[PDB]
Design a protein around this ligand. Structure first.
Ligand SMILES: COc1ccc(Cl)cc1NS(=O)(=O)N1CCC[C@H](C(N)=O)C1
Ligand SMILES: [Zn+2]
Length: 139
């Protein structure tokens, strides 16, 4: 579990979004596994605007932060699950590192700010849903 709070926005994994998230929907994209809902309180997370390929992510299944090298956002095949059928998930970045399903929502950060959130994993890999292209999160 986990979310990004920027301005009057809450960014979460679409497969973990609550009734309140859907009742205050701003934008959602199942191909990216992202959902953005509105908030009453102001958010103070800074979103990165860069093409960094190194950063640090939080892994709740180990209560640790890990440094990683990750690929640029791209279309990656993701096997069928209880939330989605087998499909290509877009804007997804992969790294070699530990992850378990409950790790989804953990933030990936570079020196410029928040890059994305954990969205996939398995077989010694971890996938992150990129958020750097969503320029409207700032305005
Ligand atoms: C051992 O499997 C995991 C390990 C770590 C992690 Cl973050 C996840 C899994 N399962 S998973 O199949 O990647 N995952 C399940 C939840 C929805 C994801 C999606 N974005 O379509 C896909
Ligand atoms: Zn950066």
């Amino acid at each position: 579990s986990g979310a990004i709070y920027v301005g009057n926005y809450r960014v979460v994994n679409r497969h973990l979004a609550t009734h309140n998230d859907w009742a205050n929907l701003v934008w959602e994209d199942s191909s990216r596994d992202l959902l953005v809902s509105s908030t009453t309180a102001q958010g103070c997370d800074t979103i990165a605007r860069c093409d960094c390929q190194t950063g640090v992510y939080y892994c709740s299944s180990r209560r640790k932060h890990y440094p990683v090298s990750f690929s640029k956002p791209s279309l990656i095949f993701v096997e069928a699950s209880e939330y989605y059928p087998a499909r290509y998930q877009s804007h997804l970045m992969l790294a070699v590192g530990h992850s378990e399903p409950g790790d989804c929502g953990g933030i990936l950060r570079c020196q410029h700010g928040v890059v994305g959130i954990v969205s996939t994993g398995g077989n010694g890999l971890v996938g992150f849903a990129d958020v750097r292209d969503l320029l409207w999160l700032d305005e």
